């Protein structure tokens, strides 16, 4: 169906009413979201159908119709924008300077903004508008708040 | 069955609400893609 570039809500009619389970990016005919949003299941776009193409539980990412296309990376010092698409609420840009998740395999950027679980898949942007990662996978700090990693795939 | 609805364009917006901190956290990632705090 609709393949126009942009940010999309991932909805389900399985639970009560229509519930937003997450968000995704449409770019170059490929839909990009987090694995925990869809669990790898097929998606619907009006009458059309989107089938999974690539996915990985550890990275927590999945692409639909083609290989992962997003390859921009955070520069390590600049402010980014979370284009948060919350349930029942209008899409909204929130500017922030990300922190750092230090791991045994290297350092990943991290946005410290708290949003409902249905906001998972919302894209993180650089000053050029390029998608540098997706919001939705991270940790719960001592405060009770959520700090998400800047999760980026690999472009083949 | 899950479906998608357009939510808008992907553009950087000048004069956006600047909030959030930049913490440095020690974390581990498991085989199930779940992050955890290491202390
Ligand atoms: O649930 C969330 N994220 C998540 C869920 C399931 C899985 C993963 C990440 C990766 N492996 C499977 C979440 C997402 C957002 Cl945007 C804000 C809070 C959140 N949480 C609250 N408690 C716990 N996560």
Reduced 3-state DSSP string for B26-39: EEEECCCCCEEECC
DSSP classification of residue A19: E
Whose alpha carbon is nearest atom 1 of ligand 1?
A117
* β-pair type (A43-45, A30-34): unpaired
Question: Which residue(s) pair with A138 in the sheet?
Answer: A148
Count of structural domains, chain A:
2
Phi, psi for A118 (deg, rounded to 5): -75, 0
User: If you measure from the C-alpha of residue A46 to the centroid of ligand 1, how many angstroms do you get, rounded to a whole number?
Assistant: 27
Q: Distance (Å, rounded) from C-alpha A83 to C-alpha A113?
A: 11
Whether residue A72 lies inside any domain: the answer is no
Out of A15, A30, A64, a domain closes at A64
- A96 and A138: one domain? yes
Contact A95, A79 (CB under 8 A): yes
Which residues 6+ apart lie within 8 Å of A82 measured at CB?
A: A93, A94, A96, A111, A113, A122, A123, A124, A125, A135
Please tell me what resolution, in angstroms, this structure has.
2.2
A12 and A46 in a single domain? The answer is yes
Nearest CA-CA distance, residue A130 and chain B, Å: 8
CB A150 within 8 A of CB A98: yes
With CB atoms and an 8 Å threshold, state whether B17 touches A94. yes
Please name the helix (run of DSSP H) or strand (run of DSSP E) that holds residue A73, with its range, or none: none
In the block, tokens 């000048």 appear at B14
User: How far apart are the C-alpha atoms of A62 and A57, rounded to whole Å?
Assistant: 9
Q: Select from A110, A111, A117 the residue to mutate for testing ligand 1; criterion: most ligand atoms less than 8 Å from CB.
A: A117
Whether residue B35 contacts residue B27, with contact meaning beta carbons closer than 8 Å, is answered with yes
Residue with tokens 């498991």: B30
Q: How far is it, in rounded angstroms, from Cα A110 to Cα A103?
A: 12
How far B39 CA lies from chain A's nearest CA (Å)? Answer: 12
* Contact between A60 and A149 (Cβ < 8 Å): no
Q: In 10 A of CB A100, how many CB atoms?
A: 18
Task: Say which experimental method was used.
Answer: X-ray
Contact between chains at A147 and B7 (C-beta distance less than 8 A) = no
Domain with residue A140: its CATH number is: 2.40.10.10
A104 vs A46: CA distance, rounded Å: 43
A60 plus A90 within the same structural domain: no
H helix or E strand, kind and range, residue A45: strand A43-45
Domain that holds residue A50: 6-64
| Same domain (yes/no): A53, A89 | no
Taking CA A84 as the corner, what is the angle to CA A80 and CA A87, rounded to the nearest 5 degrees? Answer: 170
Q: Give a yes or no: residue A24 inside a domain.
A: yes
Same domain, residue pair A85 and A52? no
Q: Which residues contact A25 (CB under 8 A, 6 or more apart)?
A: A6, A7, A8, A31, A32, A33, A70, A121, A123, A131, A134, B10
Does residue A74 fall inside a structural domain? Answer: no
A30 touches chain B (CB under 8 A): no
Return the bridge partners of A54, or none.
A63
Domain membership flag for residue A71: no
**A38, containing H or E segment:** helix A35-38
């Amino acid at each position: 169906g609709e393949t126009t570039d942009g940010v999309y809500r991932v909805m389900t009619r399985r639970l009560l009413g229509s519930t937003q389970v997450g968000v995704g990016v449409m770019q170059e005919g490929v839909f990009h979201t987090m694995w925990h949003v869809t669990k790898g299941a097929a998606l619907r776009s009006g009458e059309g159908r989107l089938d999974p193409y690539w996915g990985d539980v550890k990275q927590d990412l999945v692409s639909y119709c083609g290989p992962w296309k997003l390859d921009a990376a955070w520069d390590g010092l600049s402010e980014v924008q979370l284009l948060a698409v919350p349930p029942g609420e209008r899409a909204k840009n929130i500017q922030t300077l990300p922190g750092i998740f230090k791991t045994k395999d290297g350092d990943i950027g991290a946005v410290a903004l708290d949003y409902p679980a249905g906001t998972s898949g919302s894209p993180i942007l650089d000053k050029c508008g390029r998608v540098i990662g997706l919001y939705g996978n991270g940790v719960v700090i001592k405060n009770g708040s959520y700090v998400s990693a800047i999760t980026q795939g690999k472009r083949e | 069955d899950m479906y998608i609805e357009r939510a808008g364009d992907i553009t950087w917006e000048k004069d956006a609400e600047v909030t959030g901190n930049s913490p440095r956290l020690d974390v581990a990632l498991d085989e199930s893609g779940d992050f955890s705090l290491v202390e």
